[PDB]
């Protein structure tokens, strides 16, 4: 009777909506803004917590805080407030008691994060049922194929999950924390080295916009590094310009070379190829011909070409490789969650309120993955 609610809990942007809808109707950034300046006049903006488009409109006034980092919830009160705002009147006007929830968690996350998320979604919101899911299965559901390897690169994490004919290899899952937010932080550092400083929390969101707009992945790193580059100019919100120069392309290369930021982790291409290669041999070809991209961080200009080149370098010689990707990558996971939640069999995958009241966290560990 009550349509389940699908909440893709992105680290950068959270996407809430109803199951069965074509696109996530209620998308907004996953941060909480608080007014740092002092209120003097009557009739000022009300409330000391700003979430959603109100925060975006008055972004300069507020100081931003991110409840989620690298797929793990750090400030749990802020995450609780965020999910409460998802049920608010502004977005998705409902009552949390009536609607089962479909929350998405990054793979290989700590068990404590999942336990606390379930506790919040069963105690603070007295939902009838809950079901945690990974991004990869939902992306495959959205694209409509049971077979493939999902490389999802979000704001906090980037993970490769191979699933063959609906069977997931838990040991072949690969994950690194170098993701889009780390690219934005590296870009902030490089912009400081250029001359422009963005130390403010609000100005970090300007740096993120610069990352979204003026940044690309050169097909070959060192040739572009050697050659002089024209200084493309970007317009800041106030009106002043900035000449970016090499930081246009030296920033996203962090995704392929984590050692740029001093982290000794595999690159995104290495993540993909090792995720394929850890699986059984007989599936590898079928995995190489079915690669599904997701996450906003794979929208860099030239990401497809550089990823194809890197995988071709690392993959066995003469093996068919096609890198598929949905036309709208940001909403793919939520659309998948909606397609999953509409299934009758989803009722069998629930964690009912009685089940969580009886078994507790163990039940959440039994029915999740």
């Amino acid at each position: 009777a009550n349509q389940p609610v699908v909440i893709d809990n992105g680290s950068g942007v959270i996407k809430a909506g109803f199951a069965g809808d074509q696109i996530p109707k209620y998308c907004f950034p996953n941060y909480v803004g608080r007014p740092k300046h002092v209120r003097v006049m009557a009739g000022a903006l009300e409330g000391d917590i700003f979430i959603g488009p109100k925060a975006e409109e008055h972004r300069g006034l507020l100081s931003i805080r991110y409840p989620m980092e690298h797929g793990i919830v750090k400030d749990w009160n802020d995450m609780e407030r965020i999910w409460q705002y998802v049920y608010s009147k502004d977005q998705l006007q409902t009552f949390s008691e009536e609607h089962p929830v479909l929350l998405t968690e990054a793979p290989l996350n700590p068990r404590k994060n999942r336990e606390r998320a379930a506790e919040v979604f069963f105690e603070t919101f007295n939902v009838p049922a809950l079901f945690i899911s990974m991004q990869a299965v939902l992306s495959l559901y959205a694209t409509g194929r049971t077979t493939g390897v999902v490389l999802d690169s979000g704001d906090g994490v980037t993970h490769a999950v191979p699933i063959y004919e609906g069977f997931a290899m838990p040991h072949s899952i690969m994950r690194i924390d170098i993701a889009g937010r780390d690219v934005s932080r590296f870009l902030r550092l490089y912009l400081r080295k250029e001359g422009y400083d963005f130390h403010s929390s609000s100005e970090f969101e300007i740096v993120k916009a610069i990352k979204e707009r003026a940044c690309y992945l050169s097909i070959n790193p060192q040739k572009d590094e050697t050659l002089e580059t024209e200084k493309a100019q970007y317009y800041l919100p106030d009106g002043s310009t900035i000449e970016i120069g090499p930081s246009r392309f030296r920033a996203p290369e962090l995704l392929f070379r984590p050692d740029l930021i001093g982290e000794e982790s595999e690159g995104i291409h290495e993540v993909l190829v090792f995720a394929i290669q850890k699986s059984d041999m007989d599936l590898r070809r079928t995995l190489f011909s079915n690669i599904v991209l997701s996450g906003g961080s794979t929208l860099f200009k030239g990401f497809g070409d550089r990823l194809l080149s890197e995988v071709k370098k690392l993959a066995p010689k003469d093996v068919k490789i096609r890198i598929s990707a949905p036309q709208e990558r940001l909403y793919s996971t939520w659309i998948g969650g909606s397609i999953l939640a509409s299934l009758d069999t989803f009722k069998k995958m629930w964690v009912s309120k009685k089940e969580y009241e009886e078994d507790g966290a163990r039940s959440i560990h039994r029915k999740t993955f």
Binding site: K36, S63, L189, R192, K193, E194, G195, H199, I261, G262
Partner: protein, 372 residues
């Protein structure tokens, strides 16, 4: 042996001397003063612009500009004047005869170092030169090769961890809150107290008040309560005129902005939190050693009680088992220069110079390949 000059161009104060010496030969504020009045006839013995102590003595009529702001040279003509005064007037040495080991803060603009090298090689025609990170030199001065240097001067406060001589560029943390910001906050709170200081000349008076009277409170709230309930902390200072002005709680509110940037309006971490974050960015194995070798540097770390406050704050933040040891040598104000002199007195450093031949071959950009 031709001694190489060492010129620490601080944001506020320029120091200069010869390699191998114990202390800088010349130590003068890095200011360029210009006369304020234009229309009226000018007297007999006058200069178009004054530099260093000459500007400081005559600051009553002059208007002062700092060439370096937040560790970035914004006025290159003024900085060229400062270097000319340093070499010809103060040191009294031909720049073309000796190499020069300049200093710069970490994470500065690349164009800053490039223009520094270009000015040194073209205008002054030095036979060679080098640019060194201030924190590395200050660690050299302390006789250590492992530790975390929190060097805080007039313009910037930068934290650099080093382990066994191997720097860790990804754990360096820079803050624009240092010195000048504290002087401006002291101006503001003084204005609330009643004494209004607005002109650039009065900035020197407020800076002198900060140097003489201000101190770091071990416990901020307790000292605030003591100031409110008693006048024991009130201390009197004499202006150059002769006016006596009493400073109360403002003695320990000006340096408190080091540990609470929210007073200055910046949503940044304090120096204790910056140091702790820089330590935590390092690998787990070396962190203990850094906790045992925290080194304070720069002139702004000369407040009384800053070592105890930093030790308390880091001990609160850090795990209980680890032993914290803030090293605050008495001569730390010059520690950035002294290590530089050591770095210029080493025999192995003759290969680290940027010779003029290499500068002509590769241009200014070689500074990014050689120095750091």
């Amino acid at each position: 042996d031709i001694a190489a000059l060492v010129v620490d161009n601080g944001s506020g104060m320029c120091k200069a001397g010869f390699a191998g010496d114990d202390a800088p030969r010349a130590v003068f504020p890095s200011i360029v003063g210009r006369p304020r009045h234009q229309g009226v006839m000018v007297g007999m013995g006058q200069k178009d612009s004054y530099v260093g102590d000459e500007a400081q003595s005559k600051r009553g009529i002059l208007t002062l500009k700092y060439p370096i702001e937040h560790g970035i040279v914004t006025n290159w003509d003024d900085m060229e004047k400062i270097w000319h005064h340093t070499f010809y007037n103060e040191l009294r040495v031909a720049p073309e005869e000796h190499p020069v080991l300049l200093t710069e803060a970490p994470l500065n603009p690349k164009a800053n170092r490039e223009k520094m090298t270009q000015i040194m090689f073209e205008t002054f025609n030095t036979p060679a030169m080098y640019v060194a990170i201030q924190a590395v030199l200050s660690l050299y001065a302390s006789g250590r090769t492992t530790g975390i240097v929190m060097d805080s001067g007039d313009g910037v406060t930068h934290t650099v961890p080093i382990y066994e001589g191997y720097a860790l560029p990804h754990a360096i943390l820079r803050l624009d809150l240092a010195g000048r910001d504290l002087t401006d906050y002291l101006m503001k709170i003084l204005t609330e107290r009643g004494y209004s200081f607005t002109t650039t000349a009065e900035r020197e008076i407020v800076r002198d008040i900060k140097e003489k009277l201000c101190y770091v409170a071990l416990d901020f709230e307790q000292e605030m309560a003591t100031a409110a309930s008693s006048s024991s902390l009130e201390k009197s200072y004499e202006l150059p005129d002769g006016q006596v002005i009493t400073i109360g709680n403002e003695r320990f509110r000006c340096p408190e902005a080091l540990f609470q940037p929210s007073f200055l309006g910046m949503e940044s971490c304090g120096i204790h939190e910056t140091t702790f974050n820089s330590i935590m960015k390092c690998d787990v194995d070396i962190r203990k050693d850094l906790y045992a070798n925290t080194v304070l540097s720069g002139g702004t770390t000369m407040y009384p009680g800053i070592a105890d406050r930093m030790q308390k704050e880091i001990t609160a933040l850090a795990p209980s088992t680890m032993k914290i040891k803030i090293i605050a040598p008495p001569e730390r104000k010059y520690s950035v220069w002294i290590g530089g002199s050591i770095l210029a007195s080493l025999s192995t450093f003759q290969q680290m110079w940027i010779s003029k031949q290499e500068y002509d071959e590769s241009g200014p950009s070689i500074v990014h390949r050689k120095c750091f």
